Design an enzyme around this catalytic site. Structure first.
Site, short mmCIF file in Angstrom:
data_model
loop_
_atom_site.label_atom_id
_atom_site.label_comp_id
_atom_site.label_asym_id
_atom_site.label_seq_id
_atom_site.Cartn_x
_atom_site.Cartn_y
_atom_site.Cartn_z
N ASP A 60 0.12 -8.37 -9.58
CA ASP A 60 -0.98 -9.31 -9.87
C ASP A 60 -2.36 -8.70 -9.65
O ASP A 60 -3.26 -8.96 -10.42
CB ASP A 60 -0.83 -10.56 -9.01
N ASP B 105 0.82 -1.20 0.00
CA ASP B 105 0.00 0.00 0.00
C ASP B 105 0.86 1.25 0.00
O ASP B 105 2.07 1.21 0.23
CB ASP B 105 -0.91 -0.01 1.24
O1 LIG Z 1 0.00 1.94 9.09
C1 LIG Z 1 -0.37 2.38 7.79
C2 LIG Z 1 -1.70 3.14 7.79
O2 LIG Z 1 -2.67 2.23 8.28
C3 LIG Z 1 -4.00 2.71 8.25
O3 LIG Z 1 -4.43 2.93 6.90
C4 LIG Z 1 -4.63 1.70 6.20
C5 LIG Z 1 -5.42 1.98 4.93
O4 LIG Z 1 -4.58 2.75 4.08
C6 LIG Z 1 -5.17 3.19 2.88
O5 LIG Z 1 -6.23 4.14 3.11
C7 LIG Z 1 -5.86 5.50 2.92
C8 LIG Z 1 -6.57 6.07 1.67
O6 LIG Z 1 -6.20 5.35 0.52
C9 LIG Z 1 -6.23 7.53 1.50
O7 LIG Z 1 -6.86 8.04 0.32
C10 LIG Z 1 -6.62 8.30 2.77
O8 LIG Z 1 -8.01 8.32 3.03
O9 LIG Z 1 -5.99 7.72 3.90
C11 LIG Z 1 -6.22 6.34 4.16
C12 LIG Z 1 -5.35 5.96 5.36
O10 LIG Z 1 -5.92 6.44 6.57
C13 LIG Z 1 -5.74 2.02 2.10
O11 LIG Z 1 -6.46 2.53 0.98
C14 LIG Z 1 -6.63 1.12 2.95
O12 LIG Z 1 -7.08 0.00 2.21
C15 LIG Z 1 -5.89 0.70 4.22
O13 LIG Z 1 -6.76 -0.04 5.07
C16 LIG Z 1 -4.11 4.02 9.02
O14 LIG Z 1 -5.42 4.55 8.86
C17 LIG Z 1 -3.06 5.04 8.60
O15 LIG Z 1 -3.12 6.19 9.43
C18 LIG Z 1 -1.68 4.39 8.67
O16 LIG Z 1 -0.66 5.27 8.24
#
Ligand SMILES: OC[C@H]1O[C@H](OC[C@H]2O[C@H](O[C@H]3[C@H](O)[C@@H](O)[C@@H](O)O[C@@H]3CO)[C@H](O)[C@@H](O)[C@@H]2O)[C@H](O)[C@@H](O)[C@@H]1O
Ligand SMILES: OC[C@H]1O[C@H](OC[C@H]2O[C@H](O)[C@H](O)[C@@H](O)[C@@H]2O)[C@H](O)[C@@H](O)[C@@H]1O
Length: 596
Positions: free
Chosen positions: A248, A187
């Site tokens: 993938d 990610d």
């Molecule tokens: O420790 C890493 C991270 O973990 C959590 O976030 C995991 C999710 O990360 C992504 O989501 C992000 C979005 O894509 C962004 O557009 C924005 O909204 O921020 C979020 C992260 O908060 C991913 O897309 C998800 O599938 C994951 O579950 C925590 O929430 C973060 O604060 C941490 O840094």
């Protein structure tokens, strides 16, 4: 007569994972960690695993996968690789992979091998695997923290221009592969690449496209054929070129978040150029479908949170969409959340579509990219063909209020001459022989069918418009006379690095030589050729490459059938037809037929 040909130039990673079928079945910690906004405690991980082992592992959900909230994973090996999911955990990754093994399960890991933990940087004794000359501290630009602009200060982004970087990244990927991990979910690479998020603003320093592509190439090579590479935040520049070349799976939607219908089907329907291009998975699956199929990408619709939906019809629709698209089937309900909803994930006939390798496409309506014209593909009607020639057909009603009839016609839409036996997989009912699949669907409801054409003397038709496309091959409908909804064009010379192609998965009962027919158009004013191969899922050659010849015809509205023979092995074969540099002219391809 056919002549020998060179291999086609490819532009995809083309791994055993994407060649063999649809996405994996797994469980993910997100149903805990997202609502808690916290890393999953070790005992909660354990209790969920024990619940899966007794209730879902027998239905193939046999990977337990971690997710984010990894800032608190600071302990590392002597080479800077995290030893467990969180510092509160008493046991390391190896202990948990073995605990899973004892329950007929495997460990899935969420991590980005371009993350370098501050704690590893701060420990001068830690050095790059195989490179004792490079301290982990020597891998990072001071202050270059992941999420720096929103307060991040625990993880650095790797500087891929520093000596030791390749060894660090590849070592990290192989560290998990060696631990027994079959699935690595990577990610935040869009944040790495351009330092931006369209929901936020600036998030950290950008690192640029070249570095992103280099990092992806390292990850691809290190993962090999043993570990599946999930790209969780793809920018998808240049129609997903780097992701397709190196991964993938690609996420095609905004996060499941609080779940429910608005996340599945709402938020916004328009495309944007930034991660995520489409917000909801109906649109994302539809919009990225031209990149799906065997040897291309598996599209990832994120996590299923069954209990966040408002009704059982919505829960069925959630599942039916993931299955129709060939997505991973990721359960995020915890043991506390599942309630009486296990059934949505364990319908054996629906699962059989996933086991058999269904990768559907939305019904294509025109050639225009869906990002430019949402009329070009139908988000609500999906079909895909299984290797044995049968089909999965899924019909959806995304209206919030109206009951709406949806139909897929086997001749006009799929391009078949035969009709088929139709089974409704939620009614578990045989509807008998029919010319179409249809349903009058309540709001948010759906229907999914197995359609099994009869095979007079073994004849099996595979329409090109529902197959996998690569290298510039694509859908069109701009010359009449095709069977079904259209045909494939772009099977012509061009300037590029890749050769246009179509891939069909075909299943036969025994090794042998089979009659093959190709319905085609060619009005180039001369004979045209294409290169044809048959291969195993592992890429090994079963037949070809050979040049097959396509006689010139009067106009582009004129269709012909070229005849050939192809050697196929028992079971799954990938039959690929494409235009290499040494091929002549061009064709439009409607379908192939095998007499098996
Ligand atoms: O420790 C890493 C991270 O973990 C959590 O976030 C995991 C999710 O990360 C992504 O989501 C992000 C979005 O894509 C962004 O557009 C924005 O909204 O921020 C979020 C992260 O908060 C991913 O897309 C998800 O599938 C994951 O579950 C925590 O929430 C973060 O604060 C941490 O840094
Ligand atoms: O070369 C095969 C191709 O020939 C015709 O199309 C020619 C030309 O039409 C547009 O300019 C497109 O943008 C180009 O990519 C095409 O080469 C046929 O109409 C077409 O069906 C066929 O595939």
């Amino acid at each position: 007569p056919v002549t020998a040909a060179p291999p086609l130039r490819l532009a995809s990673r083309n791994s055993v994972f994407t060649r063999s079928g649809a996405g994996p079945r797994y469980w993910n910690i997100y149903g805990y960690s997202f609502p808690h906004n916290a890393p999953i405690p070790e005992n909660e991980w354990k209790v969920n695993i024990d619940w899966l082992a007794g209730n879902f592992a027998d239905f193939g959900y046999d990977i337990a996968c971690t997710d984010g909230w990894i800032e608190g994973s600071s302990r590392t090996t002597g080479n800077g690789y995290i030893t467990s999911y969180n510092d509160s955990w008493q046991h390391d990754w190896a202990y948990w992979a073995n605990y899973l093994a004892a329950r007929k399960m495997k460990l899935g890991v969420y991590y980005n091998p371009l993350w370098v933990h501050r704690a590893a940087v701060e420990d001068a004794s830690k050095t790059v695997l195989g490179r004792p000359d490079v301290k982990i501290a020597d891998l990072v630009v001071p202050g270059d923290f992941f999420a720096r602009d929103i307060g991040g200060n625990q993880l650095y982004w790797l500087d891929v221009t520093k000596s030791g970087a390749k060894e660090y990244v590849q070592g990290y990927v192989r560290y998990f592969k060696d631990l027994g991990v079959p699935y690595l979910r990577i990610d935040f690479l869009s944040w790495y690449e351009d330092g931006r998020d369209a929901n936020i603003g600036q998030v950290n320093a950008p690192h640029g496209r070249a570095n992103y592509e280099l990092a992806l190439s390292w990850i691809n090579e290190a993962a090999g054929e043993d570990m599946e590479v999930s790209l969780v935040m793809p920018h998808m520049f240049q129609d997903g070129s780097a992701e397709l070349a190196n991964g993938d799976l690609v996420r095609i939607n905004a996060d499941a978040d609080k779940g429910g219908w608005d996340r599945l089907s709402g938020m916004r329907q328009n495309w944007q150029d930034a991660w995520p291009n489409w917000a909801n998975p109906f649109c994302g699956f539809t919009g990225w479908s031209h990149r799906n199929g065997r040897g291309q990408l598996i599209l990832d619709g994120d996590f299923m949170r069954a209990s966040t939906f408002a009704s059982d019809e919505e829960r069925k629709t959630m599942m039916n969409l993931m299955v129709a698209a060939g997505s991973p089937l990721a359960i995020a309900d915890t043991y506390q959340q599942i309630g009486n909803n296990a059934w949505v994930y364990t319908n054996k006939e629906v699962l059989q579509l996933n086991a058999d390798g269904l990768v559907g496409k939305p019904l294509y309506r025109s050639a225009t990219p869906f990002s430019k014209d949402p009329g070009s593909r139908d988000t609500e009607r999906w079909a895909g063909q299984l290797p044995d020639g049968s089909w999965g057909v899924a019909l959806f009603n995304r209206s919030d209020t109206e009951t709406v009839t949806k139909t897929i016609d086997f001749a006009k839409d799929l391009g078949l001459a035969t009709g088929g036996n139709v089974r409704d997989l939620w009614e578990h009912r045989n509807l008998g022989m029919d010319s179409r699949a249809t349903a009058a669907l309540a709001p948010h409801a759906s229907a999914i069918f197995r359609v099994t054409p009869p095979k007079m003397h073994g004849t099996t038709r595979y329409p090109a418009a529902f197959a996998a496309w690569g290298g510039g091959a694509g859908f069109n409908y701009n010359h009449p006379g095709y069977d079904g909804n259209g045909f494939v064009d772009g099977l012509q010379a061009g300037s590029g690095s890749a050769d246009p192609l179509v891939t069909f998965a075909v299943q036969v009962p025994h090794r042998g030589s089979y009659a093959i027919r190709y319905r085609y158009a060619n009005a180039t004013g001369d004979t045209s050729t294409m290169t044809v191969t048959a291969e195993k899922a592992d890429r090994s050659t079963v037949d070809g490459p050979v040049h097959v010849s396509f006689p010139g015809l009067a106009t582009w509205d004129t269709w012909g059938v070229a005849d050939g023979t192809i050697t196929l092995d028992a079971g799954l074969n990938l039959v690929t037809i494409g235009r290499g540099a040494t091929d002549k002219g061009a064709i439009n391809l409607n379908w192939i037929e095998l007499d098996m």
